[PDB]
């Protein structure tokens, strides 16, 4: 199966099936057990693509369409109403941190020369 001569320089190089080395039977005696690849037989144009270390296209128990739908449906559930979460924050019936010395204006980096606006809070 020569590669489609669309516009590239694949030449007469055959099109081996686009299957990873992992799909090859481990029990079968392989000349290169690291690559699970024999001697002399044609090797894929993308052997590095489909080596065990690199991209693996071995079959999965559940279909690829359902593969992404549940993952995408998962993260979509997170982000979409985490927005709903942040617009309706959860808290306790608490007020502001009533603080002394004009809400620590001086000790929070405020300018000591300029007189701060008095922030005061009486008891209840």
């Amino acid at each position: 199966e020569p590669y489609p001569d669309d516009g590239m320089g694949y030449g007469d190089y055959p099109k081996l099936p686009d299957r990873s080395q992992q799909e090859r039977d481990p029990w079968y005696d392989w000349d290169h057990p690291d690559l699970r690849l024999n001697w002399g037989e044609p090797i894929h144009w993308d052997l590095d693509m489909y080596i065990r270390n690199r991209v693996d296209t071995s079959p999965t128990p559940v279909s690829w369409n359902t593969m992404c739908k549940h993952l995408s449906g998962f993260v979509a559930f997170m982000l979409f109403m985490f927005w709903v979460g942040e617009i309706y924050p959860s808290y306790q019936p608490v007020g502001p941190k009533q603080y002394p010395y004009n809400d620590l204006y001086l000790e929070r980096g405020g300018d000591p020369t300029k007189e701060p606006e008095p922030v005061v809070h009486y008891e209840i």
Binding site: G7, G9, Y10, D18, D31, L47, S63, N65
Partner: protein, 128 residues
Amino acid sequence: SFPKYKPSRLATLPATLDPAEYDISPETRKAQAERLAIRSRLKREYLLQYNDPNRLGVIEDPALIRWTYARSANIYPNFRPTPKTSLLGALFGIGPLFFWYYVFKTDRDKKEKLIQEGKLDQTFNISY
């Protein structure tokens, strides 16, 4: 019950689920005969060179040498300037270069516009 396991490029269809695997027939029966017969000879002379006592060298793999040429030198000898290669070359060539030109120039003029009247803050930005 259970719809199917639909294969994809990265989720391939296993041989167990392959229908043609279970559709054995006489004409494909002899077709799988030479698959191992070709393999058997390729395992024979390889092992012969593998276990030769006087073999002091590297058993060159003609398939490996063919792969190296095909992926390193043969691309241009069998290249053709077909229209498809031009769009692919242009899209992956000057395309991103001009795309980053739009992004980078816009920020550079925007940043230069902001500083020239002093909106951007460089109170402690000295290590330029």
